Design a protein around this nucleic acid. Structure first.
Length: 246
DNA sequence: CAGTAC
DNA sequence: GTACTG
């Protein structure tokens, strides 16, 4: 009966094995015990009150409807903006656990100053309902993790990740956000053997590693305008997002 | 560390 | 594997 309790707690966003085990030792057994007696991060509090909804998957139709909401808000600021839903959606699954939306602009400068205003715009709609993590320092990239909800009756809260990248990084960003995790892990593992390195930012070609294999020097950033360029440079046959669902 | 994103 | 913040 301890194992299903650790399971219960782990499904709280921002709680993993260590936290669940600690809670168990405190004698907590139910979500109500957690809500009333446990110390929660603001993140953990949000995941707890959305516990049911977060367990639910969603139809890819609703994922579209979410990406449409984000795209419209962003476009209003600039119409040259590109919004692409990634993750399971781009891989073509019929269900999605969350919605992962990547934003860029082809001119490669108009993407700036959008991130802060876009979230603000979506908060005013009542679309974004809670915020979990905000990263504004990922180099030229900015990422937000949050919770939204489509308008209308009988709507559930959904996990939403929004990332903004420069067009010169759009290729490697799409590659990362689309996945899958095992797929991304595989490409990057492959690059390490070729003396390269892959990230959500760029693919680099002359990466130095020590005898033990620890990276001691960065490489040379290779210009990758599209995903196909990345596959090519790594000596790989191109895969479509649908084929990337490992 | 712990938890998270893919 | 790579890499953020809590």
């Amino acid at each position: 009966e301890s194992v299903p309790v650790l399971e219960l707690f782990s499904n709280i966003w921002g709680a993993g094995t260590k936290t669940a085990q600690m809670w168990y030792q405190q004698g907590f057994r139910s979500l109500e015990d957690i809500r009333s007696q446990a110390s929660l991060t603001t993140q953990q509090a949000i995941g707890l009150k959305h516990y049911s909804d977060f367990l639910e998957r969603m139809p890819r139709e609703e994922a579209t409807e979410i990406e449409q909401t984000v795209q419209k808000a962003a476009q209003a600021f600039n119409s040259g903006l590109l919004c692409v839903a990634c993750g399971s959606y781009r891989r073509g699954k019929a269900t999605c656990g969350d919605v992962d939306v990547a934003i860029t602009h082809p001119d490669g400068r108009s993407h700036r100053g959008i991130f802060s205003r876009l979230l603000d715009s979506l908060r005013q709609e009542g679309f974004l309902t809670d915020d979990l993590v905000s990263q504004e320092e990922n180099g030229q990239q900015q990422k937000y993790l949050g919770v939204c909800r489509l308008p209308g009756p009988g709507r559930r809260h959904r996990r939403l990740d929004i990332i903004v990248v420069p067009y010169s990084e759009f290729a490697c960003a799409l590659l990362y956000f689309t996945g899958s995790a095992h797929f991304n892990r595989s490409m990057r593992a492959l690059a390490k053997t070729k003396g390269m390195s892959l990230s959500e930012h760029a693919l680099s070609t002359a990466v130095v590693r020590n005898t033990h294999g620890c990276k001691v020097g960065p490489g040379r950033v290779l210009p990758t305008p599209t995903e196909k360029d990345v596959f090519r440079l790594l000596g790989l046959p191109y895969r479509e997002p649908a084929e990337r669902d490992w």
